[PDB]
């Protein structure tokens, strides 16, 4: 499985490493897929690049 | 957080529901993000639409 | 500009046509980008494939 | 609805804010989905990372 | 490397197999990447789901 | 056709230009799509942003 996770910028490397680990494990348990087959891409978003209800996250 | 998960076709609805819940919880706990802010998209791939090493995963 | 829009299944073809036109106009006007250069991809999600708060939408 | 928009780098924060607002409203009215449910991600592309016809947008 | 290719519906399985092979080789050779590390996802678009210049 | 290619950061501009050209040509000939219609997006990943088996790929 291949997961792409869009998150807001600002997390530490350590936090993102945890995210990759926990999500990968979750995918593995859910689908009975071998952990080694799971790939995760983290894509960071700047605050001014993410909109909710037409408004900036930065705001 | 918005996660898109590409998986091969063949899983049950029950499995996919579990995937959504477990992944959402993992994201929420890892990032200290509100659970309701987490969105998950499951994208199924037909076997003939996924390649590894230039060959079909068939 | 290239837009991919994930939406729940269930809309008519005409509704999706309107979506493409209106989003394309918005992108062109906002960025002063040539309208003819704007590409929009509609990706439909089955209800059992979209989660909000860990629950099916 | 969730929209991801790939655009070339170079726009101001203000332009991108306008983009997010206008695209979100366009999605909302076209699909009659509540505006507050609409998420928009802006993904900026470097000039050297976007190809048309096998040629860089840089040229 | 991971490539996702959006294409209009209508191509044969044979064409899509060729697409995966040729794109994977192009990525591998261009980036000096191990061929087995290359993944390609084909995503088909219905004609009514793809807009250029605001028109279908 | 529209291709998005996720690759690890570290390549030169020249390498990425070659990638775009060769991938665009491969798409064109494989699908018999006019080359001028082919668009390619390169998306670079930092090493700390890519996981295999729950571990950073690095």
Tell me briefly what this model is:
The PDB classes it as isomerase. Chain A has 59 residues and is α+β, with helices and mostly antiparallel strands.
List keywords for this structure.
heterohexamer, A: 59 residues, alpha+beta, Macrophage Migration Inhibitory Factor, 32% helix, F: 58 residues, two-stranded antiparallel sheet, elongated, plasmid (chain E), 2-hydroxymuconate tautomerase (chain E)
Structural class call of chain A reads: alpha+beta
Give the overall shape of chain A: elongated
- The CATH class of chain A is Alpha Beta
CATH architecture descriptor of chain F = 2-Layer Sandwich
> What's the number of structural domains of chain F?
1
What kind of sheet is the major sheet of chain F? 2 strands, parallel
- The run of helices and strands of chain F is EHEEE
Q: Might you state the CATH topology name of chain A? A: Macrophage Migration Inhibitory Factor
Instruction: Tell me the count of domains of chain A.
Output: 1
Family (chain C): Belongs to the 4-oxalocrotonate tautomerase family.
Protein name (chain C): 2-hydroxymuconate tautomerase
InterPro entries (chain C): 4-OT, 4-OT-like_dom, Tautomerase/MIF_sf
Catalytic activity (chain C): (2Z,4E)-2-hydroxyhexa-2,4-dienedioate = (3E)-2-oxohex-3-enedioate
Describe the fold and architecture.
- The complex is a heterohexamer, with five copies of chain A and one copy of chain F (58 residues).
- In chain A, 32% of the residues lie in helices and 32% in strands.
- Chain A is of the alpha+beta class and 59 residues long.
- Chain A has a single domain, classed as Macrophage Migration Inhibitory Factor, CATH 3.30.429.10.
- In chain A, β3 (50-52) and β4 (55-56) form a beta hairpin.
- The longest helix of chain A is centred in the middle third of the chain and has 19 residues, at 13-31.
- Chain F is an alpha+beta fold.
- Chain F has one domain: Macrophage Migration Inhibitory Factor, CATH 3.30.429.10.
- Chain F contains one helix and four strands; from the N terminus they run βαβββ.
- Chain F has one helix at 13-31, and strands spanning 2-8, 39-45, 50-52, 55-56.
- In chain F, the strands form two sheets. A two-stranded parallel ribbon of chain F has the order 1-2. In chain F, strands 3-4 form a two-stranded antiparallel sheet.
- In chain F, β1 (2-8), α1 (13-31) and β2 form a beta-alpha-beta unit.
- Chain F starts with a strand and ends with a strand.
- Chains in contact: A-B, A-D, A-E, A-F, B-C, B-D, B-E, C-D, C-E, C-F, D-F, E-F.
- The E-F interface holds E 1-8, 11, 15, 18-19, 21-23, 25-27, 29-31 and F 1-8, 11, 15, 18-19, 22-23, 25-27, 29-33.
- β2 of chain B pairs antiparallel with β3 of chain C.
- It is classed as isomerase.
- Keywords: enamine formation, isomerase.
- The assembly is hexameric.
